[PDB]
């Protein structure tokens, strides 16, 4: 360590920062303002660095004073404790489901009905069934032979002026 | 088309209002009447065209009016830089100029 | 937007003199060009105009038959050929660009008709 | 050369639906008897397009935006529309694109232009060359900062017996143009049908475009007064403007290789079904085509409401440092730190991070942070890394292979060197 | 653009802006000769199991 030393032989001050993600209350955070919490809505949440998408609701899950996060069978987050107010909030993934189109052949009509599978007629001539929310098919009291199967005992067909009925 | 300006000489002081007149021997077509300023040793500078349209860069104390054979150039509040000779011109039938009005300091 | 005249000087009465105007900084070939003169201490007098394409020309009554105006759009020049000059033609001759009226004026070339 | 044109006839803007128009070959590939699905900036079907007229004195040529693209169609019989203008401000302060069509030729320039309000091409007679010339100096006054020029065959060629449709795009550095000429007899509005636009050019102008304007021609034959907002008459020529959007289309191909039909997958669930089944015919039955998912509306950020700064100053700007064999360790906890300022500081000659980048470090919380500090020489700095070997990494300071953090170093010859 | 195959004459009317053709597998079906603007079909060389 002489001033006339080559650069490879000159002194260098080294600082090594190591970050550990112990599953614990993360105290060292980087400068970020918190926001208000919105319940019963689909939101993209961030709790102490843990992120995800879901609906945050009130819960009756009695976490122990040392417990901060809950997990499901799949090891995904089930519930969190709000870092500002020590309450337990359940995380329910936002409503989703398959979309099926119920239609007669294009050789007959270009009118279609849309079935939203395994959802309620909320988030979406609307007929609620146990298969999902069926929109566009008229609910008819008269029974007939099954034509285009939907499920759970409900079938659809193109009949009478003509329209899709369920 | 002969343009006769009046008066021949106008003697005023800064802050006052100047009225310059231009009379044509024949009616000017399409209000094609322009006004020009000339300071000693300088080329003329356009002030007004279309009888009432101010040229770019010309301050709003200059305004033009009139029609037919009788036109007026008004300077609402004279500034020292405004003392000069003023020529009117018609450009509807050939191109002819007035004989000029000198605006001097009283 | 600049006009520079040339060709001025003294000329004996009856002889000829050609003035030239070099243009730069604008689309010269799209503007009509005028000549204007001013005798010492007197008013402005229009002399001639040439159209943007050189097809049409007009002259003041006092110079008809004696003056000829021309232009060269490839060289951005306008020329005024002044023949059989009289003592009353002594003046400063301005080159000026049509806007109609003239909105760009050259500094002028002094022509003195004298022996 | 810069005369204004301010005839005052106000009429409200009209709107029309583009049933099936604006389809263009996305690539220069040949396909036959095949259905192909591609995502690209297209004009959605039955789209709400504006309508502008130029009939008499009603003239419509305002400055319109160029958000992502344009579908420009024109019903003409006299070639009144000569070209367009593209740019942000359309003044000498910025570069702008120009496209104009002379008889049997095209002129394209990218200069810094100074357009006057309500531009247009002027037509007159010249009395030499004996031919009505078409001087273009009415559009722009001056042309500075020219970088690009290009000439080619006419883009526009010959009530309304012909239809000219154009598609403009401003992809990364290329201005792409698709065109088609279709003859039709309809006189009111767009003819419902189908026709694809073939690509024409791809100009590498490489500029930023947000606004655009159209160029038309005027007729002053029966009489000519002095240049003013008068003495002009415009024949019946109208144009429609539509903005493109990223859309997934399903394209059809015939034997010849022409498109002749297409489908917008997001138009309706039936189109979703057709795209899912890769066919324009759907058999009777029930098909699963997509998935409904509720999207989040806002983010929720929650952290403990504590207020303290991590003492990085006494770690980095420490007066003296430790030997590498007895390297000091500082444990940082219960504080808030800005790694962005640390990374910003150029005092450091080495700043390598592992398992995480510093730019994405000032928004992640950790339970503990350890700050190890020591002094080594230049050629040993490279040994401070996971899976390195040497006298320092083996006997003095060893980093794990699963290390998550950053290694920072700077030359301290002015502080840690003695004359002797 | 490289490949192996038999180059033959074709009756495929490429448009003036089209230079290459492709098959269902996205492989090249035909090309336009860069020197003489004719369309040539590309047929993979005969093969089969033994
Ligand atoms: C092209 O120009 C537009 C506007 O001239 C730019 O839009 C601006 O982008 C900046 C991004 O820093 C915003 O702060 C401004 O508010 C935007 N302007 C407006 C009016 O919204 C656009 O970014 C430019 N494109 C590029 C690639 O630089
Ligand atoms: C539609 O079905 C009828 C018989 O039901 C058949 O004759 C006809 O060809 C079909 N349409 C098409 C386009 O094939
Ligand atoms: C939908 O929500 C309502 C509450 O308004 C409930 O009564 C109904 O049973 C729900 N249906 C399904 C299928 O969940
Ligand atoms: C079916 O019949 C019941 C009673 O007979 C009636 O309440 C119900 O509204 C009927 N459904 C429809 C779709 O008309
Ligand atoms: C088009 O816009 C007008 C209002 O500008 C609106 O009334 C009309 O419904 C729109 N049409 C479509 C198809 O969105
Ligand atoms: C564009 O013109 C300006 C003059 O305002 C000049 O300074 C600049 O260098 C020009 N651009 C280039 C690339 O030379
Ligand atoms: C394909 O083109 C040929 C001639 O180029 C034409 O005869 C034929 O009809 C076209 N195909 C169709 C389906 O029209």
Author numbering:
A (entry chain C): 497 to 620, 641 to 676, 689 to 694
B (entry chain E): 2 to 107
C (entry chain D): 2 to 100, 108 to 123
D (entry chain C): 14 to 69, 77 to 178, 185 to 446
E (entry chain B): 546 to 595
Manuscript excerpt for this entry:
S from both SARS-CoV-2 and SARS-CoV-1 uses angiotensin-converting enzyme 2 (ACE2) as the cell surface receptor (Hoffmann et al., 2020, Li, 2015), ACE2 is expressed in a number of tissues, including epithelial cells of the upper and lower respiratory tracts. S consists of two subunits, S1 that mediates receptor binding and S2 responsible for viral and host cell membrane fusion (Walls et al., 2020; Wrapp et al., 2020). The S1 fragment, at the membrane distal tip of S, includes an N-terminal domain (NTD) and receptor binding domain (RBD). Although both regions are immunogenic, the RBD contains the interacting surface for ACE2 binding (Lan et al., 2020).
For antibodies showing neutralization, there was broad correlation between inhibitory potency and ACE2 blocking, whereas NTD-binding mAb 159 did not block ACE2 binding. To visualize the binding of the highly potent mAb 159, it was necessary to incubate spike with 159 IgG (the Fab alone showed no binding). This revealed all three NTDs of the spike decorated by 159 with RBDs in either one-up or all-down configurations. The 159 binding site is ~15 Å from that of a previously reported NTD binder, 4A8 (Chi et al., 2020), in which the CDR-H3 binds on the side of the NTD between the 144–153 and 246–258 loops. The CDR-H3 of 159 is 11 residues shorter than that of 4A8 (Chi et al., 2020) and binds on the top center of the NTD interacting with residues 144–147, 155–158, 250–253, and the N terminus of NTD. All 3 CDRs of the heavy chain contribute to a foot print of 515 Å2 on the NTD, whereas the light chain has little contact with the NTD (35 Å2), similar to 4A8 (Chi et al., 2020). For the anti-NTD, mAb 159 binding of full-length and Fab to virions were nearly identical, in line with NTDs on a trimer being too far apart to allow bivalent engagement (118 Å) and suggesting that mAb 159 cannot span adjacent spike trimers at the virion surface. Interestingly, although IgG 159 is a potent neutralizer, Fab 159 has no neutralizing activity, suggesting that the Fc portion is crucial for activity, although the mechanism is not immediately apparent and does not involve blocking ACE2 interaction.
